[PDB]
């Protein structure tokens, strides 16, 4: 068996074809086993609607998740990723830095 803790990155992107659109992204990478729970949060509450969730693997024992959706941030709001995995004894919460 092998188990690997995911790396978690949270960041925002505008598609170059429509620069007015802003997306909040969470790249959850290099994890094993594949079983996992991943949420975006706004001021601590779960965002129910996330339009994209794209899973892949490299080696048979290494998975990658891109989880992202359109959003309209303000300076007041705090956004975060919340990840549960068997390698994590407590849910891991990674805050979005608004400059990223």
Numbering used by the authors: 0 to 99
Original paper wording:
A recent case of systemic amyloidosis involves the highly unstable D76N mutation of beta-2 microglobulin (β2m). The D76N mutant is strongly amyloidogenic and, in contrast to the wt protein, aggregates efficiently and abundantly without seeding and under native conditions.
Mutation of D76 to N weakens a number of interactions with charged residues. In particular a salt-bridge with K41 is lost and the interaction with the R97 side chain that mediates an interaction between the C- and the N-termini of the protein disappears. The analysis of the ensembles suggests that D76 is in a key position with respect to the electrostatic interactions among surface residues. In order to confirm the role of the long-range interaction between R97 and D76, the R97Q mutant was prepared: in keeping with the above considerations, the mutant protein presents a significantly lower Tm value and intriguingly Q97 side chain is disordered in the structure. A specifically designed R97Q mutant next to the C-terminus allowed us to further test this hypothesis showing that the weakening of the interaction between positions 76 and 97 significantly decreases β2m thermal stability. Finally, to further strengthen the hypothesis about the importance of surface electrostatic interactions centered around D76 in determining the stability of β2m, the nonbonded energy was recalculated from the RAM simulation of the wt by modifying one-by-one the charge state for all the D–N mutants previously reported, as well as for R97Q. Particularly relevant is the agreement between the prediction of the increased stability for the D98N mutant and the effect of the R97 mutation: this shows an energy increase higher than any of the D–N mutations but lower than the N76 mutant in agreement with the hypothesis that the interaction between the EF loop and the C-terminal residues have an important role for the stability of the protein. Thermodynamic stability of the native fold is lowered due to the weakening of a set of electrostatic interactions and to the diminished interaction between the C-terminal residues and the β2m hydrophobic core.
